[PDB]
Design a protein around this ligand. Structure first.
Ligand code: K1P
Length: 211
């Protein structure tokens, strides 16, 4: 086992194959411990979950400081934090996976390159190299800074995202809100008048598929 796994791929290879909460260590530094939810079953496992929507219990209409720091119950609905995502995606070449489920239908998207810049970039999104069944709805968002109501699409749709003008992905939108562009949307799967019941965003090293 590795003593200070830097992501859920190094925790999984540590022989932990059950999804749930694991300690990772940013940059493999024992003083930078982070409790994360690892999805160890989807397409080979090793995924740090960084967003989960499933029941509308948690408030995602939160401010910059909340989106930078993270919030919620990592076993239920939560947001991992932009500072965490920047530090994890700085460690190597990561891939993004999005898992969606709505009334028993599933879809997914994978982006072979995924990074989040630091605060001086307003947590700039990089997403490239799409495959999947959900439709490439993140391409619209590529290169955009993050937006909250206090740093306006976040205000107009009462969510937070790497907004443009405004969104094809709104997975931090209002739960169960089927009003146009208000809900948990993935446009190229279910459009802007269908709020998706279940959504996860997760990351792992892009090379994990052949390591
Ligand atoms: C289909 C799939 N996605 S990742 C994965 N493995 C992780 C790396 C260890 N060896 C292979 C198992 N399998």
């Amino acid at each position: 086992s590795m003593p200070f796994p830097k992501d859920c791929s190094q925790a999984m290879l540590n022989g932990d194959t059950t999804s749930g909460l694991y300690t990772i260590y940013l940059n493999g530094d024992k003083a930078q411990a982070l409790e994360v939810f690892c999805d160890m079953t989807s397409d080979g496992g090793g995924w740090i979950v960084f967003l989960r929507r499933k029941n509308g219990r948690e408030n995602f209409y939160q401010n910059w400081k909340a989106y930078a720091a993270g919030f919620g119950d990592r076993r239920e609905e939560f947001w991992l934090g932009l500072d965490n995502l920047n530090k994890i995606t700085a460690q190597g070449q990561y891939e993004l996976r999005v898992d969606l489920r709505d009334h028993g239908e599933t879809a997914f998207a994978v982006y072979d390159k995924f990074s989040v810049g630091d605060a001086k970039t307003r947590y700039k999104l990089k997403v490239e190299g799409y495959s999947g069944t959900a439709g490439d709805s993140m391409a619209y968002h590529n290169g955009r800074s993050f937006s909250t109501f206090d740093k306006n699409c976040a205000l107009s749709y009462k969510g937070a995202f790497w907004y443009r003008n405004c969104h094809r992905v709104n997975l931090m939108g209002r739960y169960g809100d089927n009003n146009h562009s208000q809900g948990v949307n993935w446009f190229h799967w279910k459009g802007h008048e269908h709020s998706i019941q279940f959504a996860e965003m997760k990351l792992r090293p892009s090379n994990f598929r052949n390591l």
